Amino acid sequence: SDCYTELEKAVIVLVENFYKYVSKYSLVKNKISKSSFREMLQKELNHMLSDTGNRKAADKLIQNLDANHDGRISFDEYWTLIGGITGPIAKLIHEQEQQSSS
Amino acid sequence: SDCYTELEKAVIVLVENFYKYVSKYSLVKNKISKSSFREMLQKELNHMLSDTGNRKAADKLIQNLDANHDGRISFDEYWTLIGGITGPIAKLIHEQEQQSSS
């Protein structure tokens, strides 16, 4: 009796927040523009973004990925883009759930 | 009135599921063993792991990271390790919460 850990439902929810944008197998034959990652990020990850710098740290990754990428999408592509925003604010996140020791 | 998106609380929860293992700033002077990632993964991400192959897809990353890494932990280290397990099962996740079209 197992509850499904928050982390684990969350790895499910992150996998859906990406796979919603393809038809199940379709990583080349039906796919988004990589230019929607940086835009969908301003809808589904909106509460840490306002400074706009956190979004500039998405758009830097787009161009870095374009240089290497025909649009054979990889599952690893989206995951390695999220880690380029989740970084400068990453300390600040852990410190917001505390807020009592700067 | 904003609710805090599941994805976004979940990026918080992932950031906590890592930073709980350092004293806030301490990434070199107080830090975990990289051998704890592959082990803690068998506790907090337990419901997709049983096959044990998904865990061998963690331990493969550890050895790849050791060759490059004194233990100056980055925030990006943990995040790029989670993507090495979240991959072969990644399609299977998106297919499980649907289950109605193989």
Swiss-Prot record, chains A, B:
Gene Ontology MF terms: calcium ion binding; calcium-dependent protein binding; protein homodimerization activity; RNA binding
Entry keyword Transcription: no
Pfam families: S_100
GO biological process: one example: response to calcium ion
Subcellular localization: Nucleus, Nucleolus; Cytoplasm
SUPFAM superfamilies according to UniProt: EF-hand (SSF47473)
Residues where Ca(2+) binds: D66, N68, D70, R72, E77
Domain spans labelled EF-hand: 11-46, 53-88
Keyword Cytoplasm: yes
Recorded GO CC terms: cytosol; extracellular exosome; extracellular space; nucleolus; nucleus; perinuclear region of cytoplasm; plasma membrane
Tissue spec. comment: Ubiquitous. Highly expressed in esophagus, adipose tissues and colon. Expressed at lower level in lung, brain, pancreas and skeletal muscle. Expression is up-regulated in tumors of bladder, lung, thyroid gland, pancreas and ovary. Expressed in astrocytes.
Keywords from the UniProt entry: Calcium, Cytoplasm, Metal-binding, Nucleus, Repeat, Zinc
Domain of life from the UniProt record: Eukaryota
InterPro entries xref list: EF-hand-dom_pair, EF_Hand_1_Ca_BS, EF_hand_dom, S100/CaBP7/8-like_CS, S100_Ca-bd_sub
SMART domains: S_100
Entry remark concerning the domains of this protein: S100A16 proteins, but not other S100 proteins, have only one functional Ca(2+) binding site per monomer. Upon Ca(2+) binding, undergoes conformational changes leading to the exposure of hydrophobic patches which could be implicated in the Ca(2+) -dependent nuclear export. Binds Zn(2+). Ca(2+) and Zn(2+) do not bind to the same site. Does not bind Cu(2+).
Role according to the record: Calcium-binding protein. Binds one calcium ion per monomer. Can promote differentiation of adipocytes (in vitro). Overexpression in preadipocytes increases their proliferation, enhances adipogenesis and reduces insulin-stimulated glucose uptake.
Subunit details: Homodimer. Interacts with TP53.
PANTHER family: PROTEIN S100-A16, S100 CALCIUM-BINDING PROTEIN
Protein name according to UniProt: Protein S100-A16
